[PDB]
Amino acid sequence: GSHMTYPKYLLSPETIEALRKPTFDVWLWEPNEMLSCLEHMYHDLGLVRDFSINPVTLRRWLFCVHDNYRNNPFHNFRHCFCVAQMMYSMVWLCSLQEKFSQTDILILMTAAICHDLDHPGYNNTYQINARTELAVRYNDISPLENHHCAVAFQILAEPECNIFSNIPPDGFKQIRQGMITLILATDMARHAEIMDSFKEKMENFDYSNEEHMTLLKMILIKCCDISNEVRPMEVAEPWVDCLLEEYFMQSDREKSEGLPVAPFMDRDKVTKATAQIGFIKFVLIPMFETVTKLFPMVEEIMLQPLWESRDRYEELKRIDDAMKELQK
Ligand SMILES: O=c1[nH]c(Cc2ccccc2)nc2c1cnn2C1CCCC1
Ligand SMILES: [Mg+2]
Ligand SMILES: [Zn+2]
């Protein structure tokens, strides 16, 4: 209810407020507006203050990070914005500022923003099978994750972008180690491994234990990385069509190149509904269930929309199956 019209880059008090909740419509904003949101997060979380980040260097770094993201259907800058915004949402919801140090908060946020830098739009499975430069460079060990990670520190290496320029070397080393651990923890090949490791520490969780906290941070970045279905139905749905577009781009290339095609990327096998029912039930729900053990507030805010979505895709599945029989 402002007295005058302000530019799009000058976020309204309403936008600033809405940004703290996972209900935030990530689709309503252009890159420059999304960049202003990310900037606000760093200031609001006290990261600019506590780490003596130069405000112009923060903006310069964010702009560079944006430039280093590719125009892929799913693995684009908007995805990186979701992950970071969900991380920001979880810092407030779970009251992470109480349990975690500002260094940990800086790690969680910086890694969330950087996690998919210069993604080619073709998964590790393609990279390895196609014997790409990345696969040969990283010896088939999480090539993409290692690359996003490498690109992240290559950006921060540039003086005009170094947001950690005023952080002592000992501090920088800690942030670097943490960010690396987190960005590499995003590889879905390690999901089962990371989940089992966290569930083991769950038996008697200790916030004063470094090993426990590292696994929690890993689980948190993983939560934000795949958190699309947690968001309202209208916000969550367009992302599934985005992922399918990127997956079909790969499966077509894999078919053309004579390489094996993943069934969940296969045009004649994958369904928007069937893929989501499985992902929500067996990947999304169990992961958020263990987070709820530490943070009960996650159930009402994040498990409830996941249950709602599972039930909807199950309803949609019945319609698709009926329609596909007529097409046969
Ligand atoms: O919400 C999702 N559903 C599915 C499941 C799925 C959806 C559509 C087609 C095929 C699978 N997969 C997902 C989602 C989010 N990220 N990912 C992947 C994990 C590694 C990066 C991409
Ligand atoms: Mg990734
Ligand atoms: Zn990702």
CATH number at residue 299: 1.10.1300.10
- Considering only CA atoms, which of 102, 198, 184, 177 is closest in space to residue 149? 184
- Considering only CA atoms, which of 39, 85, 91 is closest in space to residue 65? 39
119 annotated binding-site participant:
no
The 10 Å Cβ neighbour count of residue 12 is 12
**Cα of 147 from ligand 1 centre, angstroms:** 20
Helices (H), the chain: 13-18, 31-44, 47-50, 55-67, 77-93, 96-99, 102-114, 124-129, 133-137, 143-157, 169-184, 191-202, 210-225, 233-257, 272-279, 285-294, 297-298, 304-327
Atom of ligand 1 nearest to the CA of 264: 10
* Residues with active-site annotation: 75
- Residues in the chain, overall count: 328
32 annotated binding-site participant:
no
| 273 in Cβ contact with 320 (< 8 Å) | yes
Number of structural domains the chain divides into: 1
43 annotated binding-site participant:
no
Binding pocket residue ranges, ligand 1, CB within 6 Å: 188, 226, 228-229, 240, 243-244, 247, 264, 270, 275-276, 279
CA 319 to chain centre: 31
- Considering only CA atoms, which of 44, 13, 15 is closest in space to residue 29? 15
From 78, 125, 186, 279, mutation site for ligand 1 pocket: most ligand atoms within 8 A of C-beta: 279
- Considering only CA atoms, which of 35, 125, 40 is closest in space to residue 80? 35
Reduced 3-state DSSP string for 172-214? HHHHHHHHHHHHHCCCHHHHHHHHHHHHHHHCCCCCCCHHHHH
- Considering only CA atoms, which of 133, 163, 157, 139 is closest in space to residue 39? 163
Structural domain boundaries enclosing 26: 1-328
Structure-determination approach: X-ray
Q: How far is CA 31 from CA 62, 71, 77, 264, in A?
A: 11, 12, 8, 30
